[PDB]
Structure 1
Amino acid sequence: GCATIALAGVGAGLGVMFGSLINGAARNPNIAKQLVGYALLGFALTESIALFSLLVVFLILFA
């Protein structure tokens, strides 16, 4: 139970990332397909750490 609280950090990080993507599109939206191209990269590289937390959640429960 106290192992899945690391998900709060990756949620709080992903929120500021997908808000800075909104502001980055609102600056100059000609590059918006490249801003989302870096934003999904950041989403994947933060969900890597989210899965790193979920792995030890499953490891405590099932092993």
Structure 2
Amino acid sequence: SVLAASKMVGAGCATIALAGVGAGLGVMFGSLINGAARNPNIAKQLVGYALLGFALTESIALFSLLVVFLILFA
């Protein structure tokens, strides 16, 4: 069971990328607050961009988690 042991170690080392994607997502949402404070008249437009931005940013998390699944339950 050294393979399953390395599976646990590899998945635990695999989810480090969620840190970077969370820092980026917090940067993007803080800029959404900033851009709404600069120009609130288009704020409901900006939130849309934010959601779209969060969208693509989230994908980099899920390609992390998929590898975790490909490590754990493949």
Q: Quick one: distance in 1 between partners of 2:39 and 2:55?
A: 24
Q: For the pair shown, which has the larger CA radius of gyration, 1 or 2?
A: 2
- Please report the RMSD computed on the Cα atoms of aligned residues, expressed in angstroms: 0.5
Query: Runs of 5+ in structure 2 lacking a partner?
Result: 1-11
TM-score by length of 2: 0.83
Query: Runs of 5+ in structure 1 lacking a partner?
Result: none
Aligned partner of residue 40 in structure 1, secondary structure = helix
| Deviation beyond 3 Å, 4+ runs, structure 1 | none
TM-score by length of 1: 0.97
CA positional deviation for 1:44: 0.6
Percent identical: 100
Cα displacement string for residues 1-53 of structure 1 (whole angstroms, at most 9, x for unaligned residues): 00000000100000000000000000010000111010000111011111100
Q: Quick one: distance in 2 between partners of 1:36 and 1:59?
A: 34
